[PDB]
Design a protein around this ligand. Sequence first.
Ligand SMILES: CC(C)(COP(=O)(O)OP(=O)(O)OC[C@H]1O[C@@H](n2cnc3c(N)ncnc32)[C@H](O)[C@@H]1OP(=O)(O)O)[C@@H](O)C(=O)NCCC(=O)NCCS
Ligand SMILES: CC(C)(COP(=O)(O)OP(=O)(O)OC[C@H]1O[C@@H](n2cnc3c(N)ncnc32)[C@H](O)[C@@H]1OP(=O)(O)O)[C@@H](O)C(=O)NCCC(=O)NCCS
Lengths: 137, 136
Amino acid sequence: GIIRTCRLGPDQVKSMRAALDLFGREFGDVATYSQHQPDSDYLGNLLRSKTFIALAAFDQEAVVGALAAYVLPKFEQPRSEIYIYDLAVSGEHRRQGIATALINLLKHEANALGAYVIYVQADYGDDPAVALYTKLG
Amino acid sequence: GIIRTCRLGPDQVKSMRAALDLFGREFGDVATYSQHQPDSDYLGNLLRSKTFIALAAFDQEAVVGALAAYVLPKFEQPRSEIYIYDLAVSGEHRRQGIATALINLLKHEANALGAYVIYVQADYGDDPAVALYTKL
Ligand SMILES: CC(C)(COP(=O)(O)OP(=O)(O)OC[C@H]1O[C@@H](n2cnc3c(N)ncnc32)[C@H](O)[C@@H]1OP(=O)(O)O)[C@@H](O)C(=O)NCCC(=O)NCCS
Ligand SMILES: CC(C)(COP(=O)(O)OP(=O)(O)OC[C@H]1O[C@@H](n2cnc3c(N)ncnc32)[C@H](O)[C@@H]1OP(=O)(O)O)[C@@H](O)C(=O)NCCC(=O)NCCS
């Protein structure tokens, strides 16, 4: 099959948008992730920052997995923490190690970035007004 | 005897440090918030950024309340969410409406920023590897 992963840059706004559509489909909320996407200048600036990380997995050059995380530059100490906000894999590519692959790339990014920890969603998904995270490390 | 609140700017690094010290005492972890604080260049830059908000409440010109929050520029839509990371009030100034006042100031900052929602870190405190947030 061959699934490739990479960190999206300001030059890959198109894949970023494709990753957003995947989020919409996997979360059962297409409107939220596909009908009100920000413009390209905004998406380009976001992907250009060092405190936001977008990871995508490709199958036949189509987005099949996406990971969106934020880097929190801390105030108490000169250190940073990563929080995986959204993570989803195509329903047709589950249990293949894709999310695992995105997270390993994320760890690669964290190390280069210097982040000392990574939090993930202690998901049940339903979480309307609640958002729990667990320490991946 | 009158509690004043305001958002800290790059020109108030000293108060930011005092707010940090406050977090250490009230959270029962002085070393983490007081022994390894970032240098002034770093605090200055953090305070000059628009995605970070530090609020402090004073009593006789001493920091007695502090609130540190991050603004997340969203990816699915051009909107932002605010997450209160740390919030604490002097142990000797509890139930005086200081947190409530810091929170109201935060809503003000959020509104001026356009943020459509604010979350607060679920506090049973103890939560080591489990950060939880609830909508405010
Ligand atoms: C949760 C989700 C992202 C996982 O995607 P995925 O690509 O199927 O996940 P993976 O195949 O990489 O790994 C799944 C499991 O198999 C395990 N695994 C990975 N590679 C493995 C291998 N080679 N051998 C054995 N087990 C393996 C992983 O540890 C994981 O176990 P765990 O969930 O108990 O921790 C996916 O189901 C999804 O998109 N769900 C909807 C959105 C959602 O709820 N997202 C929240 C994510 S925190
Ligand atoms: C929790 C804390 C910040 C509140 O201090 P405070 O300034 O005395 O609170 P206030 O006088 O403004 O308000 C009094 C009560 O109204 C409640 N309240 C006010 N606005 C509220 C809101 N929007 N949502 C929920 N509760 C609210 C508070 O929970 C508080 O009850 P409590 O003392 O049993 O916790 C303070 O006790 C503290 O510093 N605790 C240690 C650190 C901690 O637990 N931080 C987590 C904060 S979420």
